[PDB]
Amino acid sequence: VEHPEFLKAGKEPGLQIWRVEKFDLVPVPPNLYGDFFTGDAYVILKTVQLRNGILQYDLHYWLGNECSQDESGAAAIFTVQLDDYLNGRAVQHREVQGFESATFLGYFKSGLKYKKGGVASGFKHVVPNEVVVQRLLQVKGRRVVRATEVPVSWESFNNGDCFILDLGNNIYQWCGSKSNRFERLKATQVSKGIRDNERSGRAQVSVFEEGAEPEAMLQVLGPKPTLPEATENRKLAKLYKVSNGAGPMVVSLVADENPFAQGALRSEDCFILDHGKDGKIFVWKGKQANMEERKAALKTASDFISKMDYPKQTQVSVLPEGGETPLFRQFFKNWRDPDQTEGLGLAYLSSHIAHVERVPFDAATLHTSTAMAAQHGMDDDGTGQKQIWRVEGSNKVPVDPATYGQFYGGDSYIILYNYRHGSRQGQIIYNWQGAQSTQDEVAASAILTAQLDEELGGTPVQSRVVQGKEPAHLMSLFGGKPMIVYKGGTSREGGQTAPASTRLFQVRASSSGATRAVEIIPKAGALNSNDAFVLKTPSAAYLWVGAGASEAEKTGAQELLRVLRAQPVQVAEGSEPDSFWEALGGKATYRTSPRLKDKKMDAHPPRLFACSNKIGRFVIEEVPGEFMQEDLATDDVMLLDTWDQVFVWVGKDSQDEEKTEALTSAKRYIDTDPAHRDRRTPITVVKQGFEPPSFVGWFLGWDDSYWSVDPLDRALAELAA
Amino acid sequence: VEHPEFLKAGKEPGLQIWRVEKFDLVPVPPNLYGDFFTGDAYVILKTVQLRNGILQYDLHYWLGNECSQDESGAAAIFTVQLDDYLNGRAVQHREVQGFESATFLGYFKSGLKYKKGGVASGFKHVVPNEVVVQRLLQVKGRRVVRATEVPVSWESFNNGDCFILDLGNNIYQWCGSKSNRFERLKATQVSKGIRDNERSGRAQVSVFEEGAEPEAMLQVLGPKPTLPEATENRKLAKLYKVSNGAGPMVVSLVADENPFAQGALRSEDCFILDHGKDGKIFVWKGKQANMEERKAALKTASDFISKMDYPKQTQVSVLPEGGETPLFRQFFKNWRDPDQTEGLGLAYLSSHIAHVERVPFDAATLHTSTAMAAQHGMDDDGTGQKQIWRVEGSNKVPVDPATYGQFYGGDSYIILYNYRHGSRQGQIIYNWQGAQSTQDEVAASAILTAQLDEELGGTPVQSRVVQGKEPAHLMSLFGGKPMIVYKGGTSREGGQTAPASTRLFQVRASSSGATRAVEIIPKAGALNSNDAFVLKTPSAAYLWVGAGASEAEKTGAQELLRVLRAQPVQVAEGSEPDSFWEALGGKATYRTSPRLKDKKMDAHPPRLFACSNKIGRFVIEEVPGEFMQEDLATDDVMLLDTWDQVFVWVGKDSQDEEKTEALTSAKRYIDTDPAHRDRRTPITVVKQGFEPPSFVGWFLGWDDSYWSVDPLDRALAELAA
Numbered sequence A, B: 001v002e003h004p005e006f007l008k009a010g011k012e013p014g015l016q017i018w019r020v021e022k023f024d025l026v027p028v029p030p031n032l033y034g035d036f037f038t039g040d041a042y043v044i045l046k047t048v049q050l051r052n053g054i055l056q057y058d059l060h061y062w063l064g065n066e067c068s069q070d071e072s073g074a075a076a077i078f079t080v081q082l083d084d085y086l087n088g089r090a091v092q093h094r095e096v097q098g099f100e101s102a103t104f105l106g107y108f109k110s111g112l113k114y115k116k117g118g119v120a121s122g123f124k125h126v127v128p129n130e131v132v133v134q135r136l137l138q139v140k141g142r143r144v145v146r147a148t149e150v151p152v153s154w155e156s157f158n159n160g161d162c163f164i165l166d167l168g169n170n171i172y173q174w175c176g177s178k179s180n181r182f183e184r185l186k187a188t189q190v191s192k193g194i195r196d197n198e199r200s201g202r203a204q205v206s207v208f209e210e211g212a213e214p215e216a217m218l219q220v221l222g223p224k225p226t227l228p229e230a231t232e233n234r235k236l237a238k239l240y241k242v243s244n245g246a247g248p249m250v251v252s253l254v255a256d257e258n259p260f261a262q263g264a265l266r267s268e269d270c271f272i273l274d275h276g277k278d279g280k281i282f283v284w285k286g287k288q289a290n291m292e293e294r295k296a297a298l299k300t301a302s303d304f305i306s307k308m309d310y311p312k313q314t315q316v317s318v319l320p321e322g323g324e325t326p327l328f329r330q331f332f333k334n335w336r337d338p339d340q341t342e343g344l345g346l347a348y349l350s351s352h353i354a355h356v357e358r359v360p361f362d363a364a365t366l367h368t369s370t371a372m373a374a375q376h377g378m379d380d381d382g383t384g385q386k387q388i389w390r391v392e393g394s395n396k397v398p399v400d401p402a403t404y405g406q407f408y409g410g411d412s413y414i415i416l417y418n419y420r421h422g423s424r425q426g427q428i429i430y431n432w433q434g435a436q437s438t439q440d441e442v443a444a445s446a447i448l449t450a451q452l453d454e455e456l457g458g459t460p461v462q463s464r465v466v467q468g469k470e471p472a473h474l475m476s477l478f479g480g481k482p483m484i485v486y487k488g489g490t491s492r493e494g495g496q497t498a499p500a501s502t503r504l505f506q507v508r509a510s511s512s513g514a515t516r517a518v519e520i521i522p523k524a525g526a527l528n529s530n531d532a533f534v535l536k537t538p539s540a541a542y543l544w545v546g547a548g549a550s551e552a553e554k555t556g557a558q559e560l561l562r563v564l565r566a567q568p569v570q571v572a573e574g575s576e577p578d579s580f581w582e583a584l585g586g587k588a589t590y591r592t593s594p595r596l597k598d599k600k601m602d603a604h605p606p607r608l609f610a611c612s613n614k615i616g617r618f619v620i621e622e623v624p625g626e627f628m629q630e631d632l633a634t635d636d637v638m639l640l641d642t643w644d645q646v647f648v649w650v651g652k653d654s655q656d657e658e659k660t661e662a663l664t665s666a667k668r669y670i671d672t673d674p675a676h677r678d679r680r681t682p683i684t685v686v687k688q689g690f691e692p693p694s695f696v697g698w699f700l701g702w703d704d705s706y707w708s709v710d711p712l713d714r715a716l717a718e719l720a721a
């Protein structure tokens, strides 16, 4: 038999939810997805279509707080057995009521309902046409909304939250006096949800505020009393080996600090990546491993949590070798996988960007498409008017228009750019900060950038970049010329100081076709097979063009040579005269790392976070699922972490200290990241109502007028409308 | 139209309940009678068949605590209009959730359910086969049980009460650790009730005790926390006249203290009988009155309660002249009504004795019928063996067998009687207490009576009687001879002291045909048309036999004369020589009051009460409805108030102080009665398992084995059986 629902499972892309009922899988009806009984356990399978057509599986089992020891054992058993039937390629997750993963929560954008009861109490997710209902839902959460069934009583209430008194044909949404308007909008989505999905749109949602409680409400609840107020270093992990059956657990430390070596993961063994400080652990299953310790990976994860005195509700993932997720992969130094040089996409595609249509860059049609803008980091073609300045002292000093495109590493600059994307106009201010610029000048450039923003109305995008990690759009501001970055001194008055005798330049290109030439230390083990290089030497000048390189960096490298007043010696990779090598002081290992080009997004999917400087305390909460304009709360500071770049979207009604610390908050986020990632990553401050295309292009249903009418008033004009 | 439910109304004996729904009468389904929404109002019509065949109506409107001002106005409007359609002869009642009259509560023996919600909240008494249910009922009350729907939460709970977690197919009765076993038996009746009446017997009642909470319960409620403890001169009234439309209320005091004169009630006017101290008022509607102030009697009652600052939930009855109830009639001096000399029964028949078959007395068949025994106060024919004793000092002294039947008012006696009723055997101890007996001797007789009880095993009935108010059974212990009671001195040694020259004797008969001759003051205004009298005078002796008198008192009076050693002069009433009248010292008003004979029970229906000497505090709570053995809690002291007599039934497991104060408790009850009733009323202490026929005869389904198996264990062996 093997299990009849196993044959229904994982056949097409979609989401499938079974509830565990007396050691059987019973399908939850699709219209009630997101409903979960508190005394039950469930299995959830999400099937994603990978770009190469092959299928992807995330298996979760979810455990209610009032769950039996038996019902949850069955959920695990089925999870393991379903993974087995899916040929052991599924990523597995243990999810616990109130504490479930960002992936899981993303499946349910209308939110979760935690219901009272379960199988043992006789309740099911089914309901006779004519159903009588009398329940109270307490709605909690900004980013991830959770409606919990509570006792039908004023004792469940407070003056901070929203509540829904569900009377069947009539749904009564009540919102506390201290309730914020964003939370109301959310409670509204939930109310709408009950009406549309239970009920079949055959119900009247009316909505009220504390003090104006209606007849129906006061009838079932009695007189309203005085109500109470509502109730209100995670970067370090360790890696471990593990050899057991299920009882005699052998746990040996392999790496004491992240970032970890990818080579520490070996196919014979199994490891636990202990990120338990931040509420998460992973079990990695080597592809040879041992069938009995692969199959007991959940039990092993359990034993580890017990042995370490981490909470029960600690999240758990088990990934098989080759089926790793970004979250997992982030903890390692330089993840690579030889099979994925060629192919469409990668072996995993994060659910929240699975629906995103990939659009390749096309200068001709860029004005036509915010999606393209977003995916290649280009707010426009780069041909708009611009002022470039150098910071000297406490002043902006016009750079000589002849040198536009040349940036010196002893300086910090500010650029003012006007952008046109037909659809949208605006301004970007780039603050380029030299790696050798004095601290006072760097800092000065930042304050001056911030001041220019203020004098210009508050509207312009504000982007900090650091030498070497130039964003796509800044590289392309110079016609077809490359952005030249010298490692050396300055370009002021008699800042003077001439050349180093021997200089190397790496010439890297972007999606847009633009190039930057960065001056680097002239060594052999800094050569890169994907770029053009230029080696200026007292003798002559070499134009090394690598195997993986293209026309764009060839042409960009020789346009640098004109500026350097030298003449090239074309030379393909590997067949190079050894005056070349003697100029570098030897000959060493390479980089032949063919770049994650189109696959950038797959390896490092964009992620949306909320940001808080509340009570001298820095917290980030991920908003899960597909990106939505509605999640951008007008009183919040948000972070859109493309990998290339970190946008910080600042809401009009956010606190003034918070939106002044926008750049600092983005840095904290970047410095705090478990991936131990490039501290030079560009940060881009964007303001509500004045978002650039490369930001809005990540949000499918972006609406320019969305805030033109207060979003809550619109939502309400559909429920009583 | 007049109202289609009006035509369905009051046609046959029975109970009808409509719920008020948007100014309409909608019938509650009969299986849910006793269910009432807390935010609704209802109309309840109880039709009783009077013994003459004519119909009787009690109209209640019931107001939930969460009731609208509009829904309750409609209830009143319908009540008044329904009374009008029933030709104005209904008795009317304003009933309020939690505070409803003894009559009303008597209609619902399984108890009442107060439900959350109502019409405005969308809830109805109907329910789709397949209905999902999840509710909590808190069960409260000993005599009148009330299950209230409460929030589904441990916060609703306490360690004292019983609760029912109704999950639909499974009903979970929980009983606190401090919950007494009688209360559990009741909670069980409610649980059974839900199973049988909702659900159609298609549900599993399981029952539990605090500490043993089952999976289903803990699943919907969460882990059980520490639970809290459960939460724990009314004889004086005044009469008032009242002349108004509905606003300008004129209220004039007519009588300052009860007992009231019946003549104070006059047909032109309306009165309020203010017993608001005890939670009750009455409006009496004169039969000429004035149609507009008759029809606004409820609104008048309202205005009175406001003007007097009595609680809203104060009970209200409006009775029409001639349609008065016992509760009402009790407040007056000597209620009479000329039309009811002849006829079958009276104009009102209290609902709780409406089903009682009247069995007239028949010596031949008395051993055959406990009903007869009860209704005439005869535990048997009276021919059993008996010892009579006189109390002299601290001793019982055998009375001379020749004088048996002669009792002297300067003595107190005790009689030990053995009774046989085929069905039942037992013993009665009568303690007769002379009106002229010294206090020490009276008291002595009581202690000696109590001691004889104890020495005889605890089993015998124990009956205190006072000279003049002899019970039926004691009169009939003397063959066909009358019970002679002298007002004078004693019958001991040389207690001696001879006659008064002129002596009168009243000779009254009972149902059984037995007579007592009582010596009274020889006056004309003590003559009574229903009795035989005997007037001994130095000259000769008169046998006055009244018009209303019968053979029984004739014969009884002349058997007294033989004992008095005199010879009679027969003389019918009205035609009497005036040597007769000169012996009495004149000639005055009579009594021609033809006795309430068969109608005794109608005028003064028996009533069952629980009794408590708890915290130096004397409380009586009426157990309403038809009399049930099940209501006789084995740990309680109860009072069965026949009018003639007050039984006090003492439960085996009642406290020792309480059952020693049994007689005193009965007296307190009698002295406390608003009727200001005869303080000489015989009190009869009866013990659990050893109840006499004249007690058990009032209980239709009396079962001798009922306590042979603990009643709770039996009830439980039907729910899980």
Ligand SMILES: Nc1ncnc2c1ncn2[C@@H]1O[C@H](COP(=O)(O)OP(=O)(O)OP(=O)(O)O)[C@@H](O)[C@H]1O
Binding pocket: A329, A333, A334, A335, A336, A337, A340, A346, A593, A594, A595, A596, A597, A603
């Ligand atoms: N198959 C993959 N799965 C997960 N991560 C990958 C994969 N391939 C490359 N990466 C990681 O993500 C980054 C992308 O590799 P890529 O070659 O595109 O970066 P790079 O060109 O070496 O340097 P840069 O970060 O400046 O682009 C690297 O840090 C690499 O370790």
Ligand SMILES: Nc1ncnc2c1ncn2[C@@H]1O[C@H](COP(=O)(O)OP(=O)(O)OP(=O)(O)O)[C@@H](O)[C@H]1O
Binding pocket: B329, B333, B334, B335, B336, B337, B340, B346, B593, B594, B595, B596, B597, B603
């Ligand atoms: N129609 C009636 N309705 C209500 N009470 C009545 C009615 N008739 C008589 N009674 C009351 O109840 C008692 C019964 O009247 P009845 O003539 O039977 O008593 P009695 O013979 O005068 O004295 P006793 O109480 O000793 O029998 C009286 O107190 C009387 O006021």
